[PDB]
Amino acid sequence: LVMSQSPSSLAVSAGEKVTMSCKSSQSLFNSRTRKNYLAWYQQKPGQSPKLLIYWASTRESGVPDRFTGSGSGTDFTLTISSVQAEDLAVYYCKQSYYHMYTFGSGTKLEIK
């Protein structure tokens, strides 16, 4: 199982929308619970990881609608509506199915 994220680095202006990908070499869809065990985390410098989305598209309580997770099977997407200064961080995807390769390599988000 290979988890791959892209792009590695995103540099945009405030207010812009961005999308990032997380691919898996194997399907993360479980025919039992019928859900994709893929989550997205926000990692700021030295801070504790922050859960943004789980079950591929379920937004964690406290997270604004600006963060949206989508996709199924092998291709997943994290969308951030209008990037703001507080969004500056590295975003990682984590799969909880086979569990051979847990986290993706991450996408760094910055402004300007």
Amino acid, single-letter form, for residue 5: Q
**Helix (H, G, I), strand (E, B), or coil: what is residue 27?**
coil
| Enclosing domain of residue 32 | 1-112
Q: If you search the block for the tokens 């402004």, which residue do you land on?
A: 111
Q: How far is it, in rounded angstroms, from Cα 93 to Cα 40?
A: 4
Report how this structure was experimentally obtained. Answer: X-ray
User: Rounded to a whole number, what is the largest CA-CA distance in the chain?
Assistant: 44
**Helix (H, G, I), strand (E, B), or coil: what is residue 86?**
helix
Q: How far is it, in rounded angstroms, from Cα 2 to Cα 67?
A: 24
CATH code assigned at 15: 2.60.40.10
CA 95 to mean position of chain CA atoms: 10
Resolution for this PDB entry, in angstroms: 1.6
Q: Which helix (H) or strand (E) holds 6?
A: strand 3-6
CB atoms closer than 10 angstroms to residue 100: 12
Please list, in sequence order, all residues whose beta carbon lies within 8 angstroms of the beta carbon of residue 16, skipping any fewer than 6 positions away: 82, 83
CB atoms closer than 10 angstroms to residue 33: 9
Name the domain count of the chain. 1
